[PDB]
Design an enzyme around this catalytic site. Structure first.
Site, PDB file in Angstrom:
ATOM      1  N   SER A  80       0.760  -1.506  -0.282  1.00 27.94           N
ATOM      2  CA  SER A  80       0.471  -0.131   0.046  1.00 27.94           C
ATOM      3  C   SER A  80       1.064   1.798  -0.140  1.00 27.94           C
ATOM      4  CB  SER A  80      -0.811   0.266   0.956  1.00 27.94           C
ATOM      5  OG  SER A  80      -1.915   0.807   0.573  1.00 27.94           O
TER       6      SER A  80
ATOM      7  N   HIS B  94      -7.359  -5.627  -0.057  1.00 26.84           N
ATOM      8  CA  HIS B  94      -6.413  -4.618   0.419  1.00 26.84           C
ATOM      9  C   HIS B  94      -5.427  -4.911   1.468  1.00 26.84           C
ATOM     10  CE1 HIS B  94      -3.498  -1.382  -1.235  1.00 26.84           C
ATOM     11  NE2 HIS B  94      -3.877  -1.128  -0.024  1.00 26.84           N
TER      12      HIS B  94
ATOM     13  N   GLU C 234      -8.718  -5.333  -4.653  1.00 23.75           N
ATOM     14  CA  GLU C 234      -8.319  -4.052  -3.894  1.00 23.75           C
ATOM     15  C   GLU C 234      -9.722  -3.091  -3.450  1.00 23.75           C
ATOM     16  OE1 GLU C 234      -5.360  -3.890  -3.184  1.00 23.75           O
ATOM     17  OE2 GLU C 234      -4.064  -4.695  -4.433  1.00 23.75           O
TER      18      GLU C 234
HETATM   19  N1  LIG Z   1     -15.309  10.284  12.117  1.00 26.33           N
HETATM   20  C1  LIG Z   1     -14.344  10.232  11.593  1.00 26.33           C
HETATM   21  C2  LIG Z   1     -13.275  11.310  12.737  1.00 26.33           C
HETATM   22  C3  LIG Z   1     -11.782  11.040  11.248  1.00 26.33           C
HETATM   23  C4  LIG Z   1     -11.050  10.231  10.670  1.00 26.33           C
HETATM   24  C5  LIG Z   1     -12.553   9.006  10.353  1.00 26.33           C
HETATM   25  C6  LIG Z   1     -14.132   9.736  11.061  1.00 26.33           C
HETATM   26  C7  LIG Z   1     -12.707   8.363   9.166  1.00 26.33           C
HETATM   27  C8  LIG Z   1     -13.119   7.473   8.371  1.00 26.33           C
HETATM   28  C9  LIG Z   1     -13.769   5.908   9.714  1.00 26.33           C
HETATM   29  C10 LIG Z   1     -15.098   5.424   9.287  1.00 26.33           C
HETATM   30  C11 LIG Z   1     -15.808   5.718   7.814  1.00 26.33           C
HETATM   31  C12 LIG Z   1     -15.456   7.247   7.044  1.00 26.33           C
HETATM   32  C13 LIG Z   1     -14.688   7.622   7.479  1.00 26.33           C
HETATM   33  N2  LIG Z   1     -11.039   8.160   9.156  1.00 26.33           N
HETATM   34  C14 LIG Z   1     -11.056   7.052   7.949  1.00 26.33           C
HETATM   35  C15 LIG Z   1     -11.062   6.881   6.547  1.00 26.33           C
HETATM   36  C16 LIG Z   1     -10.252   6.553   5.511  1.00 26.33           C
HETATM   37  C17 LIG Z   1      -9.706   5.061   6.111  1.00 26.33           C
HETATM   38  C18 LIG Z   1      -9.588   3.967   4.905  1.00 26.33           C
HETATM   39  C19 LIG Z   1      -9.405   2.460   5.416  1.00 26.33           C
HETATM   40  C20 LIG Z   1      -8.566   1.201   5.319  1.00 26.33           C
HETATM   41  C21 LIG Z   1      -8.811   0.308   4.814  1.00 26.33           C
HETATM   42  N3  LIG Z   1      -8.003  -0.516   3.995  1.00 26.33           N
HETATM   43  C22 LIG Z   1      -8.471  -1.272   3.016  1.00 26.33           C
HETATM   44  C23 LIG Z   1      -8.529  -2.931   3.713  1.00 26.33           C
HETATM   45  N4  LIG Z   1      -6.760  -3.129   5.094  1.00 26.33           N
HETATM   46  C24 LIG Z   1      -6.489  -2.525   5.613  1.00 26.33           C
HETATM   47  C25 LIG Z   1      -7.291  -1.696   6.797  1.00 26.33           C
HETATM   48  C26 LIG Z   1      -6.836  -0.187   7.775  1.00 26.33           C
HETATM   49  N5  LIG Z   1      -4.946  -0.581   7.919  1.00 26.33           N
HETATM   50  C27 LIG Z   1      -4.474  -1.114   6.916  1.00 26.33           C
HETATM   51  C28 LIG Z   1      -3.061  -1.113   6.591  1.00 26.33           C
HETATM   52  C29 LIG Z   1      -2.067  -1.608   5.205  1.00 26.33           C
HETATM   53  C30 LIG Z   1      -2.885  -2.775   4.373  1.00 26.33           C
HETATM   54  C31 LIG Z   1      -4.333  -3.199   4.643  1.00 26.33           C
HETATM   55  C32 LIG Z   1      -5.562  -2.100   5.271  1.00 26.33           C
HETATM   56  C33 LIG Z   1      -7.437   0.140   8.921  1.00 26.33           C
HETATM   57  C34 LIG Z   1      -8.738  -0.438   8.686  1.00 26.33           C
HETATM   58  C35 LIG Z   1      -9.438  -1.404   7.949  1.00 26.33           C
HETATM   59  C36 LIG Z   1      -8.676  -1.947   7.109  1.00 26.33           C
HETATM   60  N6  LIG Z   1      -7.378   0.079   4.076  1.00 26.33           N
HETATM   61  N7  LIG Z   1      -7.247   1.765   4.794  1.00 26.33           N
HETATM   62  C37 LIG Z   1     -10.190   8.632   9.340  1.00 26.33           C
HETATM   63  C38 LIG Z   1      -9.012   8.828   8.489  1.00 26.33           C
HETATM   64  C39 LIG Z   1      -7.872   9.870   8.589  1.00 26.33           C
HETATM   65  N8  LIG Z   1      -6.716   9.732   8.017  1.00 26.33           N
HETATM   66  C40 LIG Z   1      -8.182  10.545   9.514  1.00 26.33           C
HETATM   67  C41 LIG Z   1      -9.380  10.831  10.766  1.00 26.33           C
HETATM   68  C42 LIG Z   1     -10.508   9.619  10.287  1.00 26.33           C
END
Ligand SMILES: Nc1ccc2c(c1)c(-c1ccccc1)[n+](CCCCCCc1cn(CCNc3c4c(nc5ccccc35)CCCC4)nn1)c1cc(N)ccc21
Ligand SMILES: Nc1ccc2c(c1)c(-c1ccccc1)[n+](CCCCCCc1cn(CCNc3c4c(nc5ccccc35)CCCC4)nn1)c1cc(N)ccc21
Lengths: 536, 532
Positions: free
Chosen positions: A203, A442, A329
């Site tokens: 990623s 992913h 992805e």
């Molecule tokens: N109410 C709020 C306040 C702050 C933020 C908010 C929401 C959100 C958000 C949460 C739920 C719904 C909409 C928005 N977010 C999150 C939005 C982006 C989240 C993406 C999650 C994700 C999903 N995936 C795919 C599944 N696998 C993973 C993940 C996650 N991390 C990783 C890391 C490496 C590889 C894979 C992986 C983490 C979460 C779940 C799955 N990768 N990343 C925040 C982000 C910030 N940078 C800053 C503040 C906040």
């Protein structure tokens, strides 16, 4: 030292370290965890590039992981393993610039190839202490030396007011580079071969690996690269200087730092770490998914130009790269923004919900481009099937952010000298807690590449144990030689390089390797050749 | 004298000729006048009904072919000449031909009325491929076909004028249709069971009769083979028709509507034909200088608009396409294409032909076509690029307009059957790479392979018999399926949900879904947004 284990005491340029003898399934390994590679980037030093770690006296204890860099902790689904397994597993602190080393026990006689892991997390999250990044199996089973470093994320790592001295941007990458320098000088103390260093990452980590490939001072610090589900080119991994300026300034306003750059950055430095985190999502220009607020900026320094320009014109002869994607992805990103999607139901959506998602999945897109996306992904025989629409929405996000960017990284690299090997990862962990519809999300190849299935206590299938062994041979064969194939083997199907003529790549699943042609050839022609021109 | 060959139509008596058909005699009444010769002052005007004649009129041979351009791209070549006029050319050409069984059917028979194609610039009912005897003899049909004015004579319009109102070739066809209503009973034909069928420009004419209220009370069913009233080539607007006429007039030295039209009438027919090609706005293929015009009269509104809002509930339609609609047009202006070689083209030549094939396309729009049709695995393969250029032209001009029309009729209560025709005639003289070219289903529908002297294979004789059954079953009942034969499998109707159509080839019917959906979505839904 009186009665300490002779294999656990090692000196590096900063002083003495005491490591720990860890149990892996097939024998012991040596870990040196929490080695400081920079001065804590705290106080007046927030947002600044990192300085080399000042030498310490006495024996530094390197038996446990250090702090995780300050970050947003996920709370979309409390208690849920599927998100928590990515959440920080140590205390959060701005004092977080430490790295970890795993080597065979005893340390190997002659120099071993070195693998350096760079975690993902959208440049806003992640730690090298996470259970899925455990170097012990690669170290023990493949005889490899494995390093992973922490690097600043979110505002702390990537908030830029470009052209200033106090917040230049890209300092998260500069932490990563500092750690690579550290491996050059020190890895031989652990029996590592500094002349055979392969970077790998997933990623945002993959994006970083590619940014080291594109930044000249990083080039002399590694010899090969692996990019898992990420690229420096594409919609999310970089921002223009202008956009990064808008973001820092907006965040400043939001935390009570009204705007000259010095006054502003100083004010931000007095703000408590949590305040910056609590506000970092608010600076994004549109309702969107797979977009992160503070990411590498095209500064004209670390990145002399946009990754797109640099892959179009760089010479890569020279360079050996292993790249690929997981089957799904996009899917797991859908539940962080697209209305209709949830991990707790089968996420069957309407056509309205799809058009609506496309606008969030492709935020930069005009009405016309949005229609073009929708028209391209509609199955015209069943344009109303909830199941197909759900899968389309997943495909749109996956293809736009990972598959098609990877598709060209491999395209441009191979056409300009590189030996490229390409894959698609198609196996769904038997132990996944995200719903079946999400497929292979992913992130879910990582535990197989690192060898986790070999831990009998983790409830993986026997088939999965053997599959992980295979993949570890692939990755470390690539590290050792630049060819993931085993020389002593006799087909046992071969992994052919990806070329522009043939566009060959392999399926990674429980069955033996199958060679396929063209990564989403038609569909990526859409995103890479057509869509740009519907902005022009 | 044979009483079978003597008929009293409203204008007086006729003598037909008994023809030989593989399986038995048929009565044929060829060269029957249905309008006053549209000569002199009547040039460009609506046809008038033919005045009664004295005595017995000799209706035993075909009449003159309406005045038209004669093809010379490949002089001597069967593949082009088979479409060329097989009688003398004349503006005096408003005649129709009728075939019936011999003896004259006992009870009223379904009537098929053929309307030939030829881009509204060419054609004749007398061409061997439109020979109505086999269908007459085998299926017991009464088959009619009429000549209609083509080119400037049928379609030169100065919209809004009394003298050159446009669409007169269409009015010719309508007069023939009115003639069938009034007279066909005398031949044992059933005027309450008339099916129009037609190919290419013939098909769009049928489409136009469907879309024109006065024509509606003159038929009951329709077949459109490889053509439609919608699409890029079958209609022009009033503004554009006026432009073309005006320009043509200038080109023949003709300096007020009335004035201009008067001078054009003073002109030898070959002068008008000499200059008709030269009024087209761009270097192009599959566009024709003089075609029906959206006039607010015959066509109340654009076909696109008319099909969009019309009520098509009690209407049965049979539509279809051939496998390779586009190929044969490529040799008529696309650099790199020839019949005398395998025509393998470069990518550059492909981009170039796209601008010719889609003359209206903007820079971005053409790249869209080019990008959609490339084989990204392949993507500089000369065979593909050649085939893709054929596909662009077929899709843009026939297949996707058909798919669009089949869709709107089905949605708006019509009963639609659709097919793709995939058999290449063994007798064909066009090169193999052209596959099954535009126009080459007709010989099969008309039953020509049944004539043993024509050297079709036995498989083809059987195939053509099947098609004749489909079309005449369709004529008899609005359903092409054999209504007393069981196991088939059945040709299902086209619906917008399921999108079922069938392949007509040597193998038994095969049902497919979507004709040919991703690609037509491109043409029918995306590309237009890239114009407006
Ligand atoms: N109410 C709020 C306040 C702050 C933020 C908010 C929401 C959100 C958000 C949460 C739920 C719904 C909409 C928005 N977010 C999150 C939005 C982006 C989240 C993406 C999650 C994700 C999903 N995936 C795919 C599944 N696998 C993973 C993940 C996650 N991390 C990783 C890391 C490496 C590889 C894979 C992986 C983490 C979460 C779940 C799955 N990768 N990343 C925040 C982000 C910030 N940078 C800053 C503040 C906040
Ligand atoms: N220098 C000149 C002057 C005048 C005309 C010229 C050229 C041409 C021309 C010839 C060769 C290359 C470029 C242009 N043309 C020819 C342009 C139109 C050619 C269409 C060819 C075509 C190809 N197909 C598909 C294959 N089967 C057929 C045919 C033909 N007719 C029919 C009729 C019904 C069904 C099928 C069918 C006739 C030609 C060949 C194949 N249909 N029609 C003329 C046309 C006009 N309207 C007016 C004047 C002239």
């Amino acid at each position: 030292e009186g009665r300490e284990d002779p294999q656990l005491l090692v000196r590096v340029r900063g002083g003495q370290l005491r490591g720990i003898r860890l149990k892996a399934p097939g024998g012991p390994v040596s870990a040196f965890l929490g080695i400081p590679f920079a001065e804590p980037p705290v106080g007046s030093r927030r947002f600044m590039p990192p300085e080399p770690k000042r030498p310490w006296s006495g024996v530094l204890d390197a038996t446990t992981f250090q702090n995780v860099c300050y970050q947003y902790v996920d709370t979309l689904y409390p208690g849920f393993e599927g998100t928590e397994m990515w959440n920080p597993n140590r205390e959060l602190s701005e004092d977080c610039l430490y790295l970890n080393v795993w080597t065979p026990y005893p340390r190997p006689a002659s120099p071993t190839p070195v693998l350096i892991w760079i975690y993902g997390g959208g440049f806003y999250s992640g730690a090298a202490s996470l259970d899925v990044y455990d170097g012990r199996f690669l170290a023990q089973v493949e005889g490899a030396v494995l390093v992973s470093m922490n690097y600043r994320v979110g505002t702390f790592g990537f908030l830029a007011l470009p052209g200033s001295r106090e917040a230049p941007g890209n300092v998260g990458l500069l932490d990563q580079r500092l750690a690579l320098q550290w491996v050059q000088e020190n890895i031989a103390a652990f029996g590592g071969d500094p002349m055979s260093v392969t970077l790998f990452g997933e990623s945002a980590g993959a994006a970083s690996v590619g940014m080291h490939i594109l930044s000249l001072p990083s080039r002399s610090l590694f010899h090969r690269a692996v990019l898992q589900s990420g690229t420096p080119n594409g919609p999310w991994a970089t921002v223009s200087a202008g956009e990064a300026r808008r973001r820092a300034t907006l965040l400043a306003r939001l935390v009570g730092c009204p705007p000259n750059d010095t006054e502003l950055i100083a004010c931000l430095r007095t703000r408590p770490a949590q305040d910056l985190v609590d506000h970092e999502w608010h600076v994004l220009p549109q309702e969107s998914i797979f977009r992160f607020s503070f990411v590498p900026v095209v500064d004209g320094d670390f990145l002399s130009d946009t990754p797109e320009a640099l892959i179009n014109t760089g010479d890569f002869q020279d360079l050996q790269v292993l790249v690929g994607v997981v089957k799904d992805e996009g899917s797991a990103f859908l539940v962080y923004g697209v209305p209709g999607f949830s991990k707790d139901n089968e996420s069957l959506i309407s056509r309205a919900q799809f058009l609506a998602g496309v606008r969030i999945g492709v935020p930069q897109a005009s009405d016309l481009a949005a229609e073009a996306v929708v028209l391209h992904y509609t199955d015209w025989l069943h344009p109303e099937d909830p199941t197909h629409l759900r899968d389309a929405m997943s495909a749109v996000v996956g293809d736009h952010n990972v598959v098609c960017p990877v598709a060209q990284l491999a395209g441009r690299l191979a056409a300009q000298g590189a030996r490229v090997y390409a894959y698609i990862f198609e196996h769904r962990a038997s132990t996944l807690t995200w719903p079946l519809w999400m497929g292979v999300p992913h992130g879910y190849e990582i535990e197989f590449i690192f060898g986790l299935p070999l831990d009998p206590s983790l409830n993986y299938t026997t088939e999965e144990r053997i599959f992980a062994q295979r993949l570890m041979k692939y990755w470390t064969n690539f590290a050792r030689t630049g060819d993931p194939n085993d020389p002593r083997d006799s087909k046992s199907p071969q992994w052919p390089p990806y070329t522009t003529a043939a566009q060959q790549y392999v399926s990674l699943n429980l069955k033996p390797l199958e060679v396929r042609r063209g990564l989403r050839a038609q569909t990526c022609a859409f995103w890479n050749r057509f869509l740009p021109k519907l902005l022009s």
